[PDB]
Amino acid sequence: KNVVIYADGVYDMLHLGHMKQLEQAKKLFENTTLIVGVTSDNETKLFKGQVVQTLEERTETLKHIRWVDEIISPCPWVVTPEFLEKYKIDYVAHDDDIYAWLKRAGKFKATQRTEGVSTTDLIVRILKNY
Amino acid sequence: KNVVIYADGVYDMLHLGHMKQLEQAKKLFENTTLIVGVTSDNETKLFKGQVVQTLEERTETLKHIRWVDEIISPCPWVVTPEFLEKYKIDYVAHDDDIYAWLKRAGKFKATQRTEGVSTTDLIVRILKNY
């Protein structure tokens, strides 16, 4: 019955939008193990851009989140079918291409993002008042 | 066996320092129910000062934290012995006076703060780079 879900991301400056996404992946099936992958500082910088928190800070915050069962930190930047076999992952859960092969296989579970809740935007709140 | 712990605070812009505190209160005894009280916007402003997130935003974030079993939102600003009886609270868990009466009664459990991890300070990080 237990379904293994893998959700990777930068998880920089974790906010409610991030945690609703993790809650969503956790609840994709009735009995799950949610594995979260945290990307490395170097690869995030090289491919995405500026990260505020280090790998260790981003990883420690996630350990406090109710929905997170296991953590791979750091995690590979690109998911491969080897990786899926290595960790016995049944579905990859991410927002939406690079995930075509997963959707083709029956193993992609779309999860949704929440905007405006970002730590970035809460400073703007502090500031559109100054 | 189950021990009811009450930890109140503003929980504005929840960071790792906040979550380590909640983890600490949760683990005060082997079997606990951790109740978290979230203070109102008006009373925080009036007694503490400027709050960034609303009551509802601060409360929703806490629902995602592994250690939080129950939430009182909003919560009273001052704990009273009536309140303790009302919720069957065995210990109040807070950092450290206003908690003398609790310590006198055997019902105060000190928890520790973590500095420098504050959302405030992570902007300074972004900025001591500009």
Ligand SMILES: O=C(O)c1ccncc1
């Ligand atoms: O959070 C992302 O967009 C991401 C996920 C997996 N690998 C790299 C980046």
Ligand SMILES: O=C(O)c1ccncc1
């Ligand atoms: O977080 C605090 O300092 C607080 C705790 C309980 N009542 C008011 C304020």
